[PDB]
C-alpha cells in the first residue's frame, strides 16, 4: 500500500481516536449540576463536528501546500527501484525543476499576501474614517456644552 | 533521499500538530460561548469555567498523546526505508535514465529567468503595500488616541463654580479650528503625526483644566 495512503489513513486514525477519547460521557461529567443533558449533548456534538471537519480541511491543505504525495510516491519508487536492482545534466535539470516549482509556489504566495495586505489597508482606511466621523460629532457636542455654559452664565 | 527522509516530514508534522492545537482552543472557546446561550450560565459560572477547564486539560492531553504517536510513526515508518537497500539504492538516477536535450536545458533556464522577473516585480508591490499599511495603522492608532481625548472632554462634568467668558470663547474658537483640522486629515495623505489636531485638543484640555482648577 502506498505511503501517501498509509499516512492519510494513519492521520485519520489519529483524529478519529482523539475524538473517541473526548466522548460525551466525559464532557457531561465535567458539569455535574446540569440537568438538560440534551443541551450539553448538542454542545458536545457541535464541538466534535467543528473540530473534526476543520481538522480534515486543514490537513488536506497542508498536504497540498507541502506537496507530500509526490514526495512519498517518489520514496516508494526509490525503494521499488532498489528492490529491482537487488533483483537485477540529469541532476542539473532536477534542481532546475525543483527551483521552478519553488518560484511558482512563491509567485502564488505573494499574490495572496499582497491581497491580504490590500484588504488590511482598506480596513485601516474604513476604521480611521469611522473614528473621524465620530470625532466630528463629538466636536459638535462639545460646542453645545460650551454654548450651554455661556447660556447658564446669563442667569 | 535524505532531504526527503530527515527534513521534509518535519514542517509537515509541525504544521499538523500546531493547527490541531489551535483548533482545540477555538473548539473550547466555541463551547464557552455556547454556554453563555444557556440558562445554566447565570446559575453556575464557576462550575462551567472549572469543568470546561478540566475538559480542556483532558482534550489537550489526548491530542498530545495521539499526535505524538502521529509524529513518531510518520518519521519512523512512513519517512523511512529498509536500510539493507542502502547499497542498491541508485547513485541518484530517477532522472538519469531519461535523456534531457540541450534545447530543453536552456528552455528550463528561460522559464526560471522568467519567473524570477515576475517575482522581483511582485516583491516591489509587497514593499510599497507593507509601508502603506504601516502608515495607515499608525494613523488609525493616532486618531483613536485623539478620539479618546475629546470623548473624555465630553464626559467631564461642570463642577459648579462660575466660568469665565474668555475661556469659553477660547474653547469655541479652538473647536472651530479642530473641525477644519480633522477635515484636513480625512481629505489628504496620511502623515506621521497630525500636529494641528493634536495641539488644538491640547488647548482644549488646558481650557477644561482651567475651568475645573481646584
UniProtKB/Swiss-Prot annotation, chain A:
Which branch of life, at top level?
A: Eukaryota
**First-listed, main subcellular location of the protein, grouped into a coarse class:** nucleus
UniProt record, GO biological process: attachment of mitotic spindle microtubules to kinetochore; cell division; chromosome segregation; spindle attachment to meiosis I kinetochore
- UniProt keywords, alphabetically: Cell cycle, Cell division, Centromere, Chromosome, Kinetochore, Meiosis, Mitosis, Nucleus
Cell compartment(s), UniProt: Nucleus; Chromosome, Centromere, Kinetochore
Q: Name one GO cellular component term.
A: condensed chromosome, centromeric region
On subunit structure and binding partners, the annotation says:
Component of the Mis12c/MINDc subcomplex in the outer kinetochore. The KMN (Knl1c-Mis12c-Ndc80c) protein network forms the outer layer of kinetochores. The KMN network is composed of three subcomplexes: Knl1c (spc7 and sos7), Mis12c/MINDc (mis12, nnf1, mis13, and mis14), and Ndc80c (ndc80, nuf2, spc24, and spc25). The mis12-nnf1 protein dimer directly binds to the centromere histone cnp3.
State the protein's purpose: Part of the Mis12c/MINDc subcomplex in the outer kinetochore which has a role in kinetochore function during late meiotic prophase and throughout the mitotic cell cycle.
- The name of this protein is Kinetochore protein nnf1
Write the gene name.
nnf1
Shown portion of the complete protein runs from 2 to 140 of 205
UniProtKB/Swiss-Prot annotation, chain B:
Residues modified to Phosphoserine:
189, 212
Instruction: Output the GO biological process annotations, alphabetical, semicolon-separated.
Output: attachment of mitotic spindle microtubules to kinetochore; cell division; kinetochore assembly; mitotic sister chromatid segregation; spindle attachment to meiosis I kinetochore
Decide whether keyword rRNA-binding is in the record: no
The domain of life is: Eukaryota
Q: Can you cite an annotated GO cellular component? A: kinetochore
Sorted UniProt keywords: Cell cycle, Cell division, Centromere, Chromosome, Coiled coil, Kinetochore, Meiosis, Mitosis, Phosphoprotein
* Positions of post-translational Phosphothreonine modification: 191
Primary location class: nucleus
Chain segments annotated as coiled-coil in the UniProt record: 122-155
Where does it reside? Chromosome, Centromere; Chromosome, Centromere, Kinetochore
Complex formation: Component of the NMS super complex which consists of mis12, mis13, mis14, ndc80, nnf1, nuf2, sos7, spc7, spc24 and spc25. Interacts with dis1, mal2, mis14, ppe1 and ekc1.
Functional summary from the UniProt entry = Acts as a component of the NMS (Ndc80-MIND-Spc7) super complex which has a role in kinetochore function during late meiotic prophase and throughout the mitotic cell cycle. Required for correct segregation of chromosomes and for maintaining the inner centromere structure.
| Protein family membership | Belongs to the mis12 family.
Which protein are we looking at?
Answer: Centromere protein mis12
What gene name is listed for this protein? mis12
Amino acid at each position: 500500500t502506498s505511503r501517501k495512503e498509509q499516512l492519510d489513513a494513519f492521520l485519520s486514525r489519529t483524529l478519529s481516536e482523539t475524538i473517541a477519547h473526548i466522548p460525551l460521557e466525559k464532557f457531561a461529567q465535567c458539569f455535574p449540576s446540569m440537568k438538560k443533558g440534551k443541551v450539553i449533548a448538542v454542545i458536545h456534538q457541535q464541538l466534535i463536528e467543528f473540530f473534526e471537519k476543520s481538522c480534515k480541511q486543514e490537513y488536506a491543505n497542508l498536504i497540498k501546500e507541502r506537496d507530500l504525495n509526490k514526495k512519498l510516491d517518489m520514496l516508494d519508487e526509490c525503494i521499488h527501484d532498489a528492490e529491482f536492482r537487488k533483483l537485477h545534466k540529469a541532476h542539473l535539470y532536477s534542481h532546475k525543476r525543483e527551483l521552478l516549482d519553488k518560484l511558482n509556489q512563491d509567485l502564488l504566495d505573494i499574490d495572496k499576501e499582497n491581497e491580504g495586505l490590500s484588504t488590511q489597508i482598506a480596513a485601516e482606511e474604513k476604521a480611521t474614517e469611522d473614528c473621524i466621523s465620530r470625532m466630528q460629532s463629538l466636536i459638535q457636542k462639545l460646542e453645545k456644552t460650551v454654548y450651554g455654559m455661556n447660556e447658564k452664565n446669563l442667569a | 533521499l535524505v532531504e526527503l527522509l530527515e527534513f521534509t516530514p518535519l514542517s509537515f508534522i509541525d504544521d499538523v500538530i500546531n493547527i490541531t492545537n489551535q483548533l482545540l482552543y477555538k473548539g473550547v472557546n466555541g463551547v464557552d460561548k455556547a454556554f453563555s446561550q444557556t440558562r445554566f450560565a447565570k446559575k453556575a459560572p464557576q462550575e462551567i469555567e472549572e469543568g470546561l477547564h478540566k475538559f480542556e486539560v483532558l482534550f489537550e492531553s489526548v491530542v498530545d498523546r495521539y499526535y505524538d504517536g502521529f509524529e513518531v510513526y510518520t518519521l519512523r515508518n512512513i519517512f523511512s526505508y529498509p536500510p539493507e537497500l542502502k547499497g542498491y539504492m541508485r547513485t541518484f538516477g530517477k532522472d538519469v535514465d531519461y535523456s534531457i536535450t540541450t534545447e530543453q536545458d536552456a528552455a528550463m533556464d528561460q522559464a526560471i529567468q522568467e519567473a524570477a522577473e515576475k517575482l522581483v516585480v511582485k516583491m516591489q508591490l509587497r514593499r510599497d503595500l507593507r509601508m502603506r499599511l504601516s502608515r495607515k495603522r499608525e494613523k488609525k492608532t493616532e486618531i483613536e488616541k485623539h478620539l479618546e481625548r475629546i470623548s473624555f472632554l465630553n464626559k467631564v462634568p461642570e463642577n459648579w463654580q462660575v466660568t469665565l467668558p474668555e475661556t469659553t470663547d477660547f474653547l469655541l474658537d479652538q473647536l472651530g479650528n479642530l473641525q477644519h483640522a480633522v477635515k484636513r486629515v480625512v481629505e489628504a495623505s496620511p502623515t506621521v503625526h497630525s500636529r494641528e489636531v493634536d495641539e488644538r485638543i491640547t488647548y482644549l484640555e488646558k481650557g477644561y483644566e482651567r475651568l475645573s482648577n481646584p
